[PDB]
């Protein structure tokens, strides 16, 4: 089970004690409940049924034999001494049982018309119904059996089952444990409708039973967090007694299966009042009851029969013989009530909320009791819930309530359970709301929710009730006023914001890079931080490559992928094969996202108290403990870079496309870069450039190594680029160009160099020699014909000269060209082509 379920009729009945005649539509109730802060998950009407659906009594059972299943032909008394034969395949009933039959002419939900049918060689005048088939509850895998005396045969089924009802499923927030009960939800509705509320846990509704002496003996170990622990016996109950239909019906509608009166009553009163209750067979108890911590390795067997591995933070209830319960989580089988139990010891205890939560979550037992205790339970009502349970059980099952009572209230005894008072200015909710509430609203709302309120000038002294431990500061009181008045009254006013500075330079640069890559034909992906399994082995990185130093997730999505990415390429490359695998063979992807690069101090910082600002040193320590998380930009390409069309067959991706991607990013960042040959997996060592901004390395680009492509299932020819954006300085150039009105001179120069000399190094050498007259140099020819020796290449550059103050002669330009050729000779060994 999971959320707070309850039927409207019970809710209405508790509301109507103080507000006689109160009744709303389920539509209206759902709206009211949402408005004051209770999420309605489901509104589930019961039924509906039409036509002859009535109570019957099973008067005889004939077993039909020789079928794939046991089958019963049943004589059913349907009233007025009229008997019908009905074929039924269930087994969970005997002669004399009250059942619900749908005779022919009946309509069951949803839309099932019942007609007389031939079943297993016999005629059946209808069917015996299960609870699911009546839309009354989930199934017990058999048909529904009303307890003896629920109704006479022939009674109207819909009336008897109460099928007009509607069940609300609410998802109560964790700060409202008091709403895990009819008591708290009824209180809330009385607040919303300004009704008078009669508390079902008050002494006028549950008058105290006698206290003439102590019940069972009890010890409670210090520092177990138990706040209250009360015990009262009911002696001499009839074990053949079953709970009346009205009680079984309400348990069922609340999602709880009825079993026996002793257990049924504790579940009922838990639902009604919000205090979990537990029934012990007092005659299976041996000696003093004690609550203590489990020991290491201690197991206990819960009443469902599973062996629970216990831990030392877990609170037990034990006797001399065995463990009786995991405190506020689940009872043990040793004192469970049985079909022979006659003398019952009822336990109303208040456990530590955090302890119950820790324990129930480890053991995965989110029982009805445990999820109330972990949201806190009103300790003021323990004996009232005990007395309610005892009286009800003695009435249902023929007991006598014993006038003894053990009521441990801590050491020393606590007798006033109210939270401490809260001082708040009377107009504080108005200011937080932005609304001028009518005078007295705050005092009136706070009194409705149960607080005691006194006035001193503009100051209220507000003492919350014991079922509202969440009410600790003025803001908690504000929330109470605002939600009950309704958020709809709060107006909509944009704040004047001061003048901001807009996007930072880095945020602006990210937009520009992404727009430029997109325009150039790259599609963005949002890469997963979780590296592929063994990716760096697939890449073939040495054992001490910095990329291997990764931060590790303890509990990853895929156990094989615990490592956080030091590089975006593994996720981009994975996205590339996904797209290629689905028919998009020409692909160009990019990502701009942080990576995660731990270091030495990348470890833990203990809890800093949150009642104060961390000091500046504590702030800087926290930040130094985290891994470095620089922003990176990366791209991958495969297939055709340019598509085919009427103009021709299109161009395959090549390394220079990855180099051009670097230049698109650099132009977008307004920095200049240089590319230098480098060896760096996973790139092809002869088609890899390291990228520099000034003399600082910022990344790498080129074609991937053939073996990486091979081992990773990548398309042949795949290229890639990855840059560290945080290493690219934030430039802001302020050019002031002066345009020369004089004509330029054009000359070309062909230079022969060793084959391994980069062309850019020749252009740099030419520019260093040519001087200020050189306006532009552009390579337009790389030639390696037979005129050129082996391992040498001829380069021809177009040169453009221009002076700021004069027309040049050819001889002016030739002298600059000559000094450029000399500079190329001295720096890269160039020979003027001859």
């Amino acid at each position: 089970s999971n959320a707070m379920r309850l039927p409207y009729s019970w809710l209405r009945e508790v509301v109507a004690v103080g507000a006689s005649g109160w009744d709303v539509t389920p539509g209206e109730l759902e709206q009211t409940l949402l408005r004051i802060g209770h999420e309605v998950e489901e509104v589930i009407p019961l039924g509906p049924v039409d036509g002859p659906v009535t109570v019957g009594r099973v008067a005889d059972i004939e077993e039909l034999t020789g079928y794939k299943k046991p089958i019963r032909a049943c004589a059913v008394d349907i009233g007025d001494r009229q008997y019908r034969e009905i074929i039924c395949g269930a087994t969970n009933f005997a002669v004399g049982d009250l059942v619900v039959v749908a005779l022919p002419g009946a309509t069951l939900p949803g839309g099932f018309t019942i007609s007389a049918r031939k079943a297993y060689g016999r005629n059946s005048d209808g069917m015996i119904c299960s609870a699911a088939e009546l839309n009354l509850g989930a199934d017990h895998s058999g048909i529904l059996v009303l307890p003896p005396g629920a109704a006479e045969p022939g009674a109207d089924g819909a009336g008897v089952l109460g099928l007009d009802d509607v069940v609300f499923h609410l998802a109560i927030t964790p700060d409202r444990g008091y709403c895990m009960s009819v008591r708290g939800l009824a209180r809330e509705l009385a607040c919303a409708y300004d009704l008078d509320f009669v508390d079902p846990a008050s002494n006028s509704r549950v008058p105290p039973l006698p206290i003439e002496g102590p019940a069972w003996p009890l010890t409670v170990q210090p520092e177990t967090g138990v706040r209250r622990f009360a015990l009262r016996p009911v002696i001499g109950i009839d074990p053949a007694a079953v709970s009346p239909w009205w009680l079984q019906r309400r348990l069922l509608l609340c999602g709880i299966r009825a079993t026996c009166p002793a257990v049924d009553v504790t579940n009922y009163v838990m639902l009604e009042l919000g205090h979990p209750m537990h029934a012990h067979d007092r005659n299976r108890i041996s000696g003093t009851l004690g609550v203590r911590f489990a020991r290491s390795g201690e197991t206990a067997v819960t009443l469902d029969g599973i062996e629970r591995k216990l831990d030392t933070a877990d609170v037990l209830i034990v006797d001399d013989a065995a463990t009786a319960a995991i405190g506020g989580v689940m009872g043990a089988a040793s004192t469970e009530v049985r079909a022979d139990s006659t003398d019952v010891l009822l336990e109303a205890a208040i456990w530590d909320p955090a302890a119950v939560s820790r324990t129930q979550r480890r053991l995965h037992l989110p029982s009805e009791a445990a999820r109330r205790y972990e949201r806190t339970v009103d300790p003021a009502i323990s004996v009232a819930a005990l007395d309610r349970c005892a009286r009800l059980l003695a009435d249902i099952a023929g007991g006598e309530v014993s006038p003894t009572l053990t009521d441990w209230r801590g050491d020393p005894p606590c007798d006033d359970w109210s939270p401490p008072p809260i001082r708040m200015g009377v107009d504080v909710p108005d200011r937080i709301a932005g609304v001028a509430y009518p005078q007295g609203t705050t005092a009136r709302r706070l009194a409705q929710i149960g607080a005691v309120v006194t006035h001193d000038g503009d100051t209220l002294t507000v003492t919350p009730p014991s079922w509202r431990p969440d009410l600790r500061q003025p803001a908690d009181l504000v929330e109470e006023v605002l939600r009950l008045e309704g958020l709809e009254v709060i107006p909509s006013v944009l704040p004047p914001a001061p003048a901001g500075r807009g996007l930072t330079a880095g945020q602006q640069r990210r937009r520009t890079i992404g727009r430029s890559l997109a325009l150039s034909g790259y599609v963005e992906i949002l890469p997963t931080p979780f590296l592929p399994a063994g990716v760096f082995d697939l890449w073939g990185l040495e054992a001490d490559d910095s990329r291997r130093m990764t931060t590790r997730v303890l509990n990853p999505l895929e156990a094989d992928r615990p490592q956080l990415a030091t590089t975006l390429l593994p996720a981009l490359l994975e996205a590339l094969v996904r797209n290629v695998s689905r028919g998009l063979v020409d692909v160009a992807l990019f990502a701009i996202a942080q990576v995660v690069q731990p270091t030495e101090q990348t470890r833990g910082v203990g809890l800093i108290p949150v009642d104060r600002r961390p000091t500046d040193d504590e702030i800087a320590m926290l930040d130094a403990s985290l891994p470095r998380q620089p922003q990176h930009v990366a791209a991958v390409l495969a297939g055709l870079r340019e598509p085919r069309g009427p103009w021709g067959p299109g161009r395959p991706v090549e390394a220079a496309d990855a180099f051009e991607a670097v230049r698109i990013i650099a132009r977008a960042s307004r920095v200049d870069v240089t590319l230098r040959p480098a060896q760096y997996l996973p790139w092809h060592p002869g088609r890899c450039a390291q990228v520099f901004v000034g003399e600082s390395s910022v990344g790498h680009a080129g074609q991937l190594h053939p073996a990486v492509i091979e081992r990773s299932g990548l398309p042949k020819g795949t290229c890639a680029v990855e840059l560290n954006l945080d290493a690219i300085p934030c430039s802001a150039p302020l050019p002031a160009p002066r345009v020369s009105p004089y004509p330029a001179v054009f000359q070309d120069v062909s230079l022969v160099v060793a084959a391994d000399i980069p062309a850019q190094a020749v252009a740099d050498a030419v520019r260093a020699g040519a001087g200020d007259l050189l306006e532009d140099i552009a390579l337009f020819d790389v030639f390696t014909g037979p005129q050129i020796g082996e391992h040498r290449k001829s380069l021809t550059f177009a040169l453009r000269f221009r002076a700021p103050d004069r027309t040049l002669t050819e001889d002016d330009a030739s002298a600059a060209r000559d000094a450029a050729v000399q500079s190329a000779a001295e720096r890269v060994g160039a020979v003027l082509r001859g």
């Binding site: 949402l34 932005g434 104060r612 985290l626 340019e642």
Partner: protein
């Protein structure tokens, strides 16, 4: 003259990022600024300074990615709300910021959930801020992303780091199963414990905050019933949106 002429077809930024850009511009035009925070975060800022009790069940390993070793108190952040803390620690008052970035949870995938997603955080802290200012900001946010014909609703809720707390739903016409109110994000007045954990006096300053799903915003805005294509990175999802927006 109608022959194809695009020798290098356009690509596309991801629509989540284009939506983030548009949300940012909306708030910058109101004078707010865009704050940032790391994806690997301390527990101190993701849980403790945001007023989560020590045993809060969102802290368990079933709910939150933790960084090795066992108790580094490091994690993948589970909401953008730690940026409230970093901002109030780093900036002087008053503060008017949003933050947009990735958040991480150990969630099952369904039509409106994925383990790695994005949120838009908002935080305003100043003298005299009220719930009316929260509502004004949320209405401007919704009106800019969904238009004026957008049905929203605000109802009281709970977060450990706000009091009062509220949730905002959007009427989602294309919701798988039939149109219904779907939650858009959470909001409230900043809890006084959160101000005290950052050295701000709750008697002088009040604040509001909110946190909306970014993919969730895109689902409402473009009527995409199932978010998983949005997450998986197939080029076919992104190209229809265009190189820019």
């Amino acid at each position: 003259v109608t022959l194809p002429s695009t020798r290098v077809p356009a690509g596309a930024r991801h629509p989540i990022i284009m939506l983030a850009e548009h949300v940012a511009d909306t708030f910058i035009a109101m004078g707010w600024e865009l704050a940032e925070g790391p994806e690997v975060e301390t527990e101190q800022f993701n849980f403790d300074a945001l007023n989560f009790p020590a045993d809060h069940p969102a802290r368990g390993e079933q709910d939150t990615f933790y960084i090795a070793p066992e108790d580094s108190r490091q994690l993948l952040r589970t909401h953008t709300s730690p940026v409230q803390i970093r901002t109030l620690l780093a900036r002087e008052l008053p503060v008017y910021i949003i933050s947009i970035g990735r958040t991480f949870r150990t969630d099952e995938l369904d039509a409106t959930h994925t383990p790695i997603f994005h949120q838009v955080e908002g935080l305003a802290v100043d003298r005299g801020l009220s719930m009316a200012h929260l509502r004004g900001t949320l209405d401007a946010f919704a009106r800019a992303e969904f238009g004026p014909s957008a049905r929203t609703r605000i109802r009281p809720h709970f977060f450990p780091f706000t009091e009062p707390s509220a949730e905002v739903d959007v009427w989602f016409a294309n919701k798988i199963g039939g149109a219904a109110w779907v939650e858009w994000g959470g909001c409230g007045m900043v809890h006084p414990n959160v101000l005290r954990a950052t050295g701000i006096d709750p008697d002088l300053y009040s604040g509001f905050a909110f946190g909306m799903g970014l993919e969730r915003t895109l689902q409402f805005r473009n009527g995409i019933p199932d978010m998983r294509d949005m997450v998986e990175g197939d080029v076919r999802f992104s190209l229809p949106f265009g190189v820019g927006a």
